[PDB]
Amino acid sequence: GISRDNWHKRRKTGGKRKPYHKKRKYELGRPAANTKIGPRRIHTVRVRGGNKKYRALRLDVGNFSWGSECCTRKTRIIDVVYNASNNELVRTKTLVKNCIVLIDSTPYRQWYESHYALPLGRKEEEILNKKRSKKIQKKYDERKKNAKISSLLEEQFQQGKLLACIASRPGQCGRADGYVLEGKELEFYLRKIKARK
Amino acid sequence: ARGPKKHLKRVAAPKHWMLDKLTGVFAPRPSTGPHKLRECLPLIIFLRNRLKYALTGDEVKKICMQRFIKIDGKVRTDITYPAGFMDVISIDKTGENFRLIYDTKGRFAVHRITPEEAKYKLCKVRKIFVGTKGIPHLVTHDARTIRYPDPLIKVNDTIQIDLETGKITDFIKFDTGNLCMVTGGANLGRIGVITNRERHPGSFDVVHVKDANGNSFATRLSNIFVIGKGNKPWISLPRGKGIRLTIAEERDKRLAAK
RNA sequence: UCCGUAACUUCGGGAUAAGGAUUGGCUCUAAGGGCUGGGUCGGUCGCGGCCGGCGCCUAGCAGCCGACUUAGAACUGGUGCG
RNA sequence: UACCUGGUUGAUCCUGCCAGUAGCAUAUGCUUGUCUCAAAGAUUAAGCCAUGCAUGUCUAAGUACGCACGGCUACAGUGAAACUGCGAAUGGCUCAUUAAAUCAGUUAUGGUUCCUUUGGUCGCUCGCACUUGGAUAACUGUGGUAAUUCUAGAGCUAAUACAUGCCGACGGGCGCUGACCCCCUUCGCGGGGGGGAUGCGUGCAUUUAUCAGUGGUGACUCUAGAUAACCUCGGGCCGAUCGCACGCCCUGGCGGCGACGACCCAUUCGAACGUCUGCCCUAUCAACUUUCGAUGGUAGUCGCCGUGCCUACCAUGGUGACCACGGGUGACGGGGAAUCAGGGUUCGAUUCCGGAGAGGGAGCCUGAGAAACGGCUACCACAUCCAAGGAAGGCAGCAGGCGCGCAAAUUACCCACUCCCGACCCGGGGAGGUAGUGACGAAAAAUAACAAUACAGGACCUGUAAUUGGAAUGAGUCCACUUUAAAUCCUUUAACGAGGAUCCAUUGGAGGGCAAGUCUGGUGCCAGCAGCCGCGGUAAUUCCAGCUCCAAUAGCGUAUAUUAAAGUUGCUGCAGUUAAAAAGCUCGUAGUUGGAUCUUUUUACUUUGAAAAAAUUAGAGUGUUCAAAGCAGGCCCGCCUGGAUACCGCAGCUAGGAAUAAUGGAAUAG
RNA sequence: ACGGACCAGAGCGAAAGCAUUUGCCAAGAAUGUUUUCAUUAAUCAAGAACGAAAGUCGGAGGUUCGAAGACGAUCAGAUACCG
RNA sequence: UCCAAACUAAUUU
């Protein structure tokens, strides 16, 4: 079938090489997963060594990392906004290893409001304006010092949508994990999205 | 081939098994085990082609199925189990307790040791790694693994383990002046003291070994097996003490014995 | 439009040789330009300037504006489409 | 053994080829007593194949209610079948394909998979069990079909099949949360120190982010640890299994050894893809590659992984007279083989290693491992049964047959040896072994020896005889042992077995090369011979015959490939005034080659060390009766002893040497 | 058109080739040198310039000679020698 | 410096 041999290539000199064997099985390739967004549908492939790799055909839920607090939650993927490899993978909503996605921010607002007692992306009362005992209220005041998120990243929490990045290989591992874009890597991809608009 | 080989031709066999070329077409391909195929000694050609206990192959399995053969304190019933260097074959019915160590020509000598020398053996430390919860490990030249070894035992050193226990008794560091045996190459079976360990980054290291006559020779570090500390070998050496005579100096030894 | 083109020849030609593929609709995507502002501290009075400490766009940004054309892709039809 | 001889002329010296000469390996011709080894449908047709066989497998230890047998109350013990497991990816055959490809040496995987075996690990996780569920085969019973190793319907019944799933460990500990108590200050604000309920999480493997810097490496983004989490229903692990012996504590409660299985880490056998260097002929093949990936960059997809492997977006590269690209090959590669003074030349289908393919291609299932063909699925080619509806095929496996041809063996016996596979001490093996056919070839070796005469000689010795004499043996016949799986042959030993010892030696020759006749008869440029020069037209040293003789001999001619001869391909080592031949002349880039000079930086070179598959070759030891061989053997309860050493271009690695040969340092001193 | 004799085993040129006088243009060997640079060299596939005679294509010119052609001889013939 | 061509298949040293 789909072969990923080297001997169908021409040589370095440009000489056409003649095949010396039939195409062997350890040179096989399989079709691409083309993982979309939707209710979870995963197929398993029996591979060499009797092992199994999980290829996902539809995924809506991922595991992304906030990075600068080591806060990783299991959130939900909204859609794909950027792909450096192919523009037309954005329009068909395909999830690949480096594509820039857009996720729901409510597990990251909720953890932040519990770890700092400070509203994030707000224009119930119990976790924020709680009556704390003064030893406990002391502890939240040195966390209050370093509670400032950058201005590009507080914009995201108001629309409830974080701009994120895939890091795993969906269609090999069957998952979609990654990290939240922040810092100069954020504003690099922000103006690429603005330029396409 | 489409998968692994299972036969072994007679002329393609290792040289030191000393098989002959008119008995049959094949040689006993040793099973997978702790020793390499070119570095082993299968149990069938040890009992039949050295000891003359059996005359055919079917008479070897009639010995082995009656569980008269022990290797490293354990009963092995396969006639092509790979026995190798520093191994102890215990027959224990005739009460013989062999230990396989190379002679000075480079093949396994039929060597008898005392039945309290057969309680232990020696092993070359091939690999050191730590495991889960920070637990160190150790891998010998045999495929055995020791959990919680001594902190000083590093790579290429020689340990002494107890059979039927499987724990470390004593060890020898790879140093200058220690007493080693060569387990590969053109110096297979020669014994001497370590003169210089010559390092080459990336490539192989070469160890110069000085024989107990004044002769010197060099071998790769992957063939050096320390057998003694200083000048004292911790096993009983065979007849000749690992001295490689020249072809003239072994002629007259025959000629002064007629 | 994209390929592919022999004999022969006065080397110019033969030649649209011959031969083959493609063509609709719809939804997008790229690529191809032009005008403006790069002025760091009022040093400081005839909310604007008068002469100069005061600064580093210098791998160019930012605003607005503008035609037409080429290529690629998805969908779609009773295989229809110069 | 570093070798030449005949042929141009009236004669000579030459250049030069033709012809001899010697192996080698294929065919063939004539002949052939013994005996030991041994090639053998490769060459043309990787052409097509009738019939048979070549792959299955059970322990005390997965599942027996088949009376199929069988001993004295769940189950004695054998046990056909069937499920389950495992193998069937090895072996064997052939050489079509294939020219930096295969392959070889060398290295790497710090860039990957790995059934099995061996060794770790297997109460590390805080969260019906004294045993859970359903199904199916064998069997029984109804069938269908012209047909096959086709299968349908209905009733049973199992598990280490298939599912499902708990207790125990198990007291907690550790992180976060923090109600709350408590202590020391403080005019107070404030500040400081412990305890702590209730909730959330917790182990390996997986996936991602982050933090810190137990062991390792030349070098880690290694290993280990810390933290936040996640963990796929087409689903990671965390034993609902089996046998031996069975004890021990107070019905209960514990315990010895095994088997089988496990995610994972090593290990073993490897596998795959990379590094460097190495290949025959051809220029009447000089430019090739590239929006149909050609070279590279970025991101991915795929994959067991590194990678234009593939896609997207970019860049315009990449290779070539140091022979690319294209074509050819009576090309599988190598170890090797024949010849050989030194160099070489030619061969290697062929038993070992590696590759490839199973009529042509293509696609796949299962599995650790296959793009498998004694597995499926197509289409092409061919071919087989048929009741015309359909069904089945793959001898480049062992035999055998047809065809093709110059050209190649018995449809034999056996698992006894060698080994392989399986659940296995028991089964299986056309692997392999043993016989047959065997002038492929190689080793050994009969076809007479003696004595007396008759004679001849020689300086008491020897020769010649269709004279004579009894002495010796095998060939052959043939009991028996031995041999072996059973045989056969050889070896051994009885019985016979020689005078023309008729128990009969051929094959080529006799002008010269070139060993050996001017013999006799026939033929008359005829028939014929003759490798070459030649012979034969009426006295043939050459034809056809007889006689003799020579050569090598159980072998010897002949054809063809090829090596030496051939210093007639010339590196060693040829020629080029007139014999074959130096371009009309000069420039000129590659290429090749380069003066002297110094102590009297990188390489090349030289030496050494490693690491290099055996077989083969060289060679050591050893009375196969000798020898070719073989790795054996030898010495009086056993003892002693061998199974050597060398060589293995080049490339890569290692340490000495520093002549020769390149090359490099300070001149705008930077 | 041609440059005799002088004109040679003499010269020059890479070879082909080169001869009346004078002028102009550029070249070059050898010698001389106690100048200069300091290996810049030798031979050369590919490539390049030159290359008698005859022949070819354009112009000009055509005295001599003269392939082809036409005759006269010679000859067995003579589409040759000689005119 | 007038012309001047040819030479068994029938073989034996």
Ligand SMILES: [Mg+2]
């Ligand atoms: Mg036309």
Ligand SMILES: [Mg+2]
């Ligand atoms: Mg003559």
Ligand SMILES: [Mg+2]
């Ligand atoms: Mg010859």
Ligand SMILES: [Mg+2]
């Ligand atoms: Mg095979």
Ligand SMILES: [Mg+2]
């Ligand atoms: Mg391995």
Ligand SMILES: [Mg+2]
């Ligand atoms: Mg060919």
Ligand SMILES: [Mg+2]
């Ligand atoms: Mg195959």
Ligand SMILES: [Mg+2]
């Ligand atoms: Mg065939």
Ligand SMILES: [Mg+2]
């Ligand atoms: Mg196939």
Ligand SMILES: [Mg+2]
């Ligand atoms: Mg077959």
Ligand SMILES: [Mg+2]
């Ligand atoms: Mg034959």
Ligand SMILES: [Mg+2]
């Ligand atoms: Mg012979």
Ligand SMILES: [Mg+2]
């Ligand atoms: Mg005879």
Ligand SMILES: [Mg+2]
């Ligand atoms: Mg002769």
Ligand SMILES: [Mg+2]
């Ligand atoms: Mg020759």
Ligand SMILES: [Mg+2]
């Ligand atoms: Mg010679």
